[PDB]
Symmetry: D3
C-alpha cells in the first residue's frame, strides 16, 4: 500500500494505484505527493530558431523568466537601430559610397556622350554600332544600381552588428544554453536593419510552458481527462479571413509539459476511453513527444519533440485496470502496483 | 658582413644589405638563402565564406592541394542532388504534401460552391455579402500557394542536407581548420536544392596563393619592382559588356603571399621610386595587409587582411639607403645592417 | 541506374536494386562495390566480462589480433602463479600467520587444560560449568580456523595482484578500450590464486567476428538465404551427457557481424520467404541486434546487442519487391531505388 | 619566546616549548593557540570498502555528517528490496523462467518415459543401456536446477540494481569523493538481494573520527600521556563466547585523528617514559600511521595508514628535553625552540 | 538627444554631446550617467615585478584591498626571518659547515707547516720551491673563504624559502592572478635573507589606482582640464640632495585610470587647447597608454602600458567641435553625436 | 630455476640467483637477459639549472643526443651577441641614453658654474653655503653614473633577449621537458650580454649518463665490485693549484645510472665485503640515490637524487647469501630466489 507507493517514489518507477469505487483517490495521492520533494527541475521550454523552427531549451531552474525579460528588451532594439541610421557618421559612409556609384554611372555616360559625331544625348539616323555602346551603359547602370542596393544593405548590416554585439555579449555569458536562440534573434535584428521588415513579437518570444519549480513541493499534475491534446499539448492556429497561420506562441502545453520534473497522476479509465493508450505507450518508450497538430491544416511548424521527464501514477479501480493489465507492455512500463 | 647576415637570419630580423654599385647582389643573397632551411610553413590561402566575403585560412603544410581537390568534388554534387529529386521516395513525400494543399483549397471551394442559393460557380445579381466569402477563399488560396512553395523548398532542403551531411562529415574531420568554409559550401549546395540556382565555380573555390613548402629550401621571393600591387597583391575585375564583377579567384598574389614562411628580398631604390615605403611601413607595423583594389570600381569584395610572415632583406648601395636612413622608423624595422 | 547506385553509395543510404529475371545480379553489384573503398572500419568484437556476461568491444582496425594474442599469454599466467606460491618468501609469510593462529588456539587450550581440578584433558563426573568453557574453545577454534582459510586466500590474492599488475600495466596502456575486459581477466586470475579453480579458455577469450579491414576493398557480404540466424548470428550450445552449457566462444557471427563497416547485399525474395522482414526492420530502426538463441534452453548468456554499421543493398526483380513495396516502412528505410 | 612561537605558527614548523618546573604550561599554550585560526580542515575519516578493508576518506569540511546520515538511509533500503520482491511484475518474470526450467526437465522426463518397452516409470530386469539415459536426465536435472538458482539470483540482482541506481545517483553527485565507498555499499545491497544475507550496520558505517572544524578556533589536542594507542588510535575487538571479531566501528581515534588540521600539544617527558619516541619519529617521517592492533589476535582488518596533518608542539622543562636533544633526528623534526 | 545618448550607452560607443553656450552641461550628463549601472569592473592596478619593472594586474572587483593588506604582512616578514636565524637548529647547520671549511684550511696549513726542514711557520733563506706551496695555500684559503660566504648565503636562502613557502602558499591560491608579483616578493624576501639588505616598502607595494566599483553607479570621471598628465597619469620623482629616484608608488593616476570600467566625460575645448588630441587619438586607437614622464630625468621605470577600458563622452558647443569635426579620425572614434 | 627466473622477469621483481662455486654464472644470466626485451626506456640525465644546482631530466628515448647538440649551438651564441652590439641601430639607442645622462650632469654643472659671484670653476675664500651645492652635484653625478651603467646593462639585456627568444622558441616546442633548463641557459646568455662574463661550457652542458636504449636488448650492467661510488656514481673535483672546484660534467655515472630501464646484475659477496648493503637497502627503499661526494671537500654541488628504475639480480653461492639471508629486509626486497 504505502510501502509500494514509497517504493515507487524512491525507485524511478511509474506506478499504478488500485482502490475501491469511492472517488477522490486522486485528491489523497495528491496530498501525499505534495509533502515530498524532488531534485530541482530545470526550466524546459520552447524557443523559435526561426519563424518555422521550434527547439527545446533547458535552463537552470528560475532562469527562464530572466531570458524572457531579456528577449522583450531585444525586440525593442528595432527602435535603437532606427536612431542609429539617423546618425551623421552613418549617413556619411552612406552618401560616400552613393557618390562612388554615381561617379561610375555618370562617367560612362560622359564617355557615351562624346558621340557628338552622330548622336546628340537622349533623355541621326542611323545607329552606327555605337548602338551596342548604349546597351553596355544601360545594362551596366542597372548592374551598378543593384550592386548599390546590396552594398547599402551590407553597410546597414555591418553597423547593426557593431551595435548588437554589445547588447548580446552579456546575454551569451548570462545564458550559454540559449546560445543558438540568441544568435537567431541577433541575425533577425540584423535583417530588420538590412530590410526594414518588422518583427512579429509572437514569432520570436520564448514560450514558457510551466512555472519554475524548486522541487518542494514537486510539480504535480492531475489529469482526469486523457485526450491526446491534453496529454501532449497542441498547436493552435490563427485563421484571419481565409489565411491560416501559426507560431511558437500558439503551442499550448499539455500534462507532459506541466508535470516536467515531477508527477503526473492520470485517470486510467479515461486513458482507455480516449484514443490514447497506444500513443502514451509510444511516448514513454521513446522518452519524448510532439504536440498534436490538425492534420491537413495549410500552415505548420517544425517542432522538436519534448522530452518526458516525469513519473506517472495511474489511478483506478481493479475493473478499470483489467483492459490494461492484459497488455504485456503494461507491466513493463508500470512495474509497481499499489493498493487503497 | 656574413656575420651580420647570419645574425639577421638567426635572430628574427629584417635586415638590409649594403654593397658596391655592381649588379646581381640579389642573385648572391639568393644563392646563400637557398642553402638555409626554415621551420615548415603552413599553407596560407584565401577562401570565400560567401560570394562577397573572403577569409584567410591556415592549413598544415601540404593539405591545401587536398582541400582544393575535395572542393572540386563538392561542386559536382549538384548532379547528385538532381538525381536525388528523381527518386520515387522523394516524389511521394512531395505529392503527399501537394495533396494536403489541394485538399484545403478544394474544400473551401466546395464550401464556397454551396451558394446554390444565389450564385452558380464562377470560372445573380446582386452579391449578398457572400462577396466577402469569395475574397476569403482567394486570399486563402494565394496564401496556401506560397505556403506550399516554401514547404517544398524546406522539403528539398531537408533531403539535400541528409545527403550532404554524409559527404561533409569526413571533410570536417579531415580539415578542421576549413570548418567555416565547408559549412558555407554545404549551405550553398543546400540552396541549390531549394532554388535550382547554379554555382559559379569561380566564386566558391579556394584560391591557393603559393606552392606548399617543406622549408628546405626556404620560400624566397626577389622583388626588383616594388609597386603596391606587386608587393600586396591585387584584385582583378571582369567587365563583360558594361557589367563589372569580381570574385575570390580574381585575387592575384603579391610578394607577401609568395614569400610566406620565408624571405622577401626587395630592391631598396625601387621601394623609394614607387609610392610604397609608407604603405610598406604600415604593413610591417600592423602585421597584415590587404590586396590593392581599384578605388571607385562598381564591384568589390570584403577581404580579410593577409598576415605578414616573412623576413625582409633590403638590397642596395649606400646611396640608395640615404633617403631611407633619415627616417626614424627605418632602423626600428631594419635592425641589422650587413655589408658587401 | 549507375547514378542511383552512386547516389546510394555517396549518401548514407540503404538501397534496392531492381533488375531483370536473369541471375547473378548480385555477382555484378559485388564486382562494382569491390572497386570502391570505405572509411577504415574499427574492429567490432565480443568479449566476456564474466562467464555469463558478454560485451561489445571497439578497437582500432587491426588491434584485435594483438589483444587476442595478449589474452592467450594471460591465460598461461596460471602456471606462473603456481611457481610464485612455491617461493620461500611467500611460504614464510604463510607459515608466519599459520603460527599466529596455532598460538591462539593452543593457548586457549592450555587455559582450558588448567582444569586439573576436576577434568583431565580430553582427546569427573560431573561437568561443573567449565562445560561452557569447552564450547568457547570449540566454537573459537572453528572461527579461528575459518578466519585462517580466509586470511590465506587474502594473502594469496595480494601476492597474485602484485605479480599480475606488472603483466597488466602495459596492456591497459596498449588497449585502453579493453579496460573493463582486462580488469575482468585480472580479477579472474586473482581468483585462481585464491581458489585453485582453473579457467576454461573458451569462457574467457575474445570472440573475433570478422577479419580486420583496411576499407579497400570494403567489407562485403552477400546473403542469398535470409534466415534470422544467418542475418543476426546465433548462440550455439554444448550438450555433454544431459548437461547444457554455453559461452562467449559459442556465439556464431551472422551477416551483420561480417559486413560491419561495409555492405550487405541481401536477396529480397529470401527476406520475404523467411520469417525475417519484421525483425530486420526492427534491427535497422534500433541500430542494433542480438544473436538468435534457442528459446527454452536450460543455459544462456547475457549478450550486449550488436550495433548495425553497414549499408544494405536489397536485390530482386520488380515482382520480388511488390510485397515489400506495399509497406510504408519500406521506402522510409530504403530511400534509393536503382535499376538494371 | 612569543616570537619563536609566532615563528613556529607562521612557518610550517613542529616546535618545542621549554619552561620552568611550574605546571600548567600546556594550559597557557592552549589559551594562546585557541585565539588563532587555521585554514579550514577537510573531514578525514575511515570508511569500509568491505567487511575487512578500511580506507581513508577526505570530504569538504562539514560534509561527513551528511554522508553518515545518507548511509543510515541506505542501510534501511533492505526493507525496500523486500517489498520490491513482493511485486507482481517481478513474481511474473520469476515464475516465467521457473516454467522455462520445469519444461526442460519435464520433457526429457517424458522422453525418458517412452521406455514403455522395458521399463515403467520409477519414483525389468535388466537395464539395456537406457541405463545411461537415466543418468543423462539426473545429471541434467541437477545442472538445470543449479542453473535456475543462479538465474533467479541474477534476476533479483538486476531488479535490485534498477531500484538502487535511483537511490545512489544523487549520492554520487553529492559526494564524488565517496565514490568507491558508495559503490561498495551498492554492491553489498545488491548481494542482500541475491542472497538474503543481512548487513551488520557496524561493518558498513563510516567511522567519523573528530567533529568537523571551521578552523576558528583551530583543532587542538593536548596529550599528557603518550602511549602508542593514545597517539595513533587503536583497534578494539569483540570476543563473544570464544569468537573474536572486529570491524571499522571498532577503530578508536587517537591524537593524530583528533588533531587533524591543527595542533597537537604533547608532554615530552611522557613521550620518553612511554615506548613512543621511535614510533613517533617514524610517523612524522612517513607522513602517516596505522592504529595499534593486538599482535596475535585471531581477527583483523586491512587498514589504510592515516595521514599526519597537524603541527606538533612538545612541552617540557630543559631536563625533560636532554634525552631527546641528544638525538640528531630531534632538531631535524623540531626546528624551532621556544621559551617560557 | 536622449535617444542618441541611450544609443551611445547601449552600444559600445564613444560619443559627443553638443549643447548651447550655457555651462554645467557636464553636471547634467553626470546626473544622468549616475542613474545607470554597468557590468562589474575588475580592479586594474600597477604592481612592481622588480624595483624597476611595473606591470598591470587585473583582480576580481574588491580583491585589491585584500592583496594590499596581505602585502603589508609580507613586508614585516623580515622580522620573522631575523628570529629564524637566531634558532639553534640553524646555528648548528651553520657552524657545522664553518668547521668543514676551517678543517680544509687548517690541514693544508699543517701540511704547509711540516716544512720544519727549511722554514719555521710565518705569521731560511732561501725559498726552495716550497715557495709555490705557500701560494697554493693562500689562493686556496681565499677560494675556500669565498666558497664559504656563498654556502652560508645558500644556506640562509634555503631556510628562508622553507619558511616563506608556508606564508605564500595560501596567497597563490587566494590570488592566482597575482602569481608573478607574489613570486617577485618571495624572491625579494629570500634575498633579504641572503644579504641583509632591507626592503623599501615604497618599491614593493601595489599601487591601487581607484576605488573598487560594483558598477552601480558606474565609475564616472569628469575632466575639464585635458593635459597629458591628467588624462594619462604621470610619474613623479624624488630629488633628495642631488640624487634622483622613482618607484611604483610615485605613479599618479590620471582619468584613464580612474574611469576604468565606466565613463570619462571630457571637455572638448580643453582637449584642443592643450597638446592632447593627437596623443588621445593614439591612446584610443592602441587600446592602451603609458603615464607621462619627464624626458631627460636621470631616473626611470619600465612601465607596462595601461589598457583603456572606458567609454568617452566629449562635451562642448558646436563651435568647440568644429576644429575636431574636420579630422576624419574624429567621427571614426566618436560615432554618435547627441544634442542639448 | 628458469621458471623462478622467468617469474622474476615477468613480475616486477628483484631476484637472487643461487648457484654452484663454478664461476661465470654472471656471464650465463647475461646471455639469457640479452635475448629478452623491455619497454623502451626514457633518457634519464643530469642537467645544470645553475653553476651549483643539478637536476634530473627525463626525455623520450633518443632525444638527449639532440638536446646536447642544441646546447653546443646555444653556447656559441655568445659570438652572435658580440656582433649584435656592433650594430649601428644598437649603438644609436646606446649613445642616445648616454647623452640623456651627460645632459643632466652637464646642466647641473652649468647651474653650479653660475657662482661667478664668489667661486670660479674648479677642475674665494670662504665657502658661503654653496658648499652644499657642490656636494649635491657630486653625489648626483655619481648616482646618475651608476644609474647609467645599470640602464646600459638593462639595454643590452633587452636586445639580447629579443635575439635569444628567436633561438629558444623552437627549442621549447622541440624539448618541453627541458623547459626549466633552457630557461636557465637563456638567462645565462642574457647575463653574458649584461656583464661580458664568459660561460664555462663544462658548467652548462647536460651530462648524458648512458647511451639511449630501444629496449631490445635491455640495458644490462654487471657489477662484480660493489663499492658505493661504482653503484651510485661519484662526484669528481678539480684541484688546480690549491683551488677546489666542481661542476655538473664532473659527476661520474655508476651502475644505477647505466642500468636505468633494465637489469643490474650484482655480485652478492662483493656487496657484503664492501660497505654497501645498508646504503643499497636505503636506495631501493627510497627509490632514489645521490652520487658519492668527498665529505669535507671545500667545493660542492646541490644534486637532485637519481631515481632507481632497474631490476636487480643478485648472484652468488648459498654460502655468499647466508649473511644476507638473516636480515628480514632481504626477502622483503628480493622476493624471488632462483637456482643453478
Amino acid at each position: 500500500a504505502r510501502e509500494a507507493l514509497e517504493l515507487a517514489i524512491r525507485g524511478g518507477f511509474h506506478a499504478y494505484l488500485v482502490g475501491p469505487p469511492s472517488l477522490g483517490k486522486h485528491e489523497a495521492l495528491l496530498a501525499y505527493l505534495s509533502t515530498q520533494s524532488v531534485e530541482t527541475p530545470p526550466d524546459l521550454l520552447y524557443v523559435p530558431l526561426s519563424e518555422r523552427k521550434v527547439a527545446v531549451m533547458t535552463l537552470p531552474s528560475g532562469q527562464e523568466i530572466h531570458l524572457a525579460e531579456a528577449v522583450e528588451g531585444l525586440l525593442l532594439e528595432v527602435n535603437r537601430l532606427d536612431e542609429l541610421f539617423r546618425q551623421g557618421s552613418f549617413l556619411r559612409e552612406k552618401t560616400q559610397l552613393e557618390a562612388r556609384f554615381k561617379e561610375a554611372r555618370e562617367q560612362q555616360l560622359e564617355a557615351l556622350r562624346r558621340e557628338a559625331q552622330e548622336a546628340g544625348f537622349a533623355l541621326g539616323p542611323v545607329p552606327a554600332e555605337l548602338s551596342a555602346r548604349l546597351e553596355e551603359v544601360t545594362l551596366g547602370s542597372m548592374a551598378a544600381s543593384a550592386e548599390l542596393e546590396v552594398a547599402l544593405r551590407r553597410l546597414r548590416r555591418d553597423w547593426a552588428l557593431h551595435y548588437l554585439n554589445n547588447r548580446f555579449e552579456p546575454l551569451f555569458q548570462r545564458f550559454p544554453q540559449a546560445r543558438a536562440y540568441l544568435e537567431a534573434l541577433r541575425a533577425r535584428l540584423a535583417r530588420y536593419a538590412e530590410t526594414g521588415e518588422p518583427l512579429d513579437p509572437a514569432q520570436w518570444r520564448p514560450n514558457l510552458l510551466t512555472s519554475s519549480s524548486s522541487g518542494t513541493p514537486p510539480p504535480i499534475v492531475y489529469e482526469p481527462y486523457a485526450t491526446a491534446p491534453r496529454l501532449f499539448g497542441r498547436l493552435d492556429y490563427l485563421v484571419d479571413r481565409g489565411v491560416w497561420s501559426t507560431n511558437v506562441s500558439l503551442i499550448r502545453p499539455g500534462a507532459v509539459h506541466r508535470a516536467q520534473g515531477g508527477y503526473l497522476i492520470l485517470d486510467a479509465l479515461s486513458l482507455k476511453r480516449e484514443g490514447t493508450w497506444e500513443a502514451f505507450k509510444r511516448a514513454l518508450r521513446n522518452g519524448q513527444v510532439e504536440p498534436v497538430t490538425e492534420p491537413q491544416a495549410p500552415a505548420g511548424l517544425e517542432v522538436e519533440p519534448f522530452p518526458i521527464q516525469m513519473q506517472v501514477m495511474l489511478v483506478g479501480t481493479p475493473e478499470a485496470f483489467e483492459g490494461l493489465e492484459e497488455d504485456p507492455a503494461f507491466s513493463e512500463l508500470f512495474r509497481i502496483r499499489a493498493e487503497f
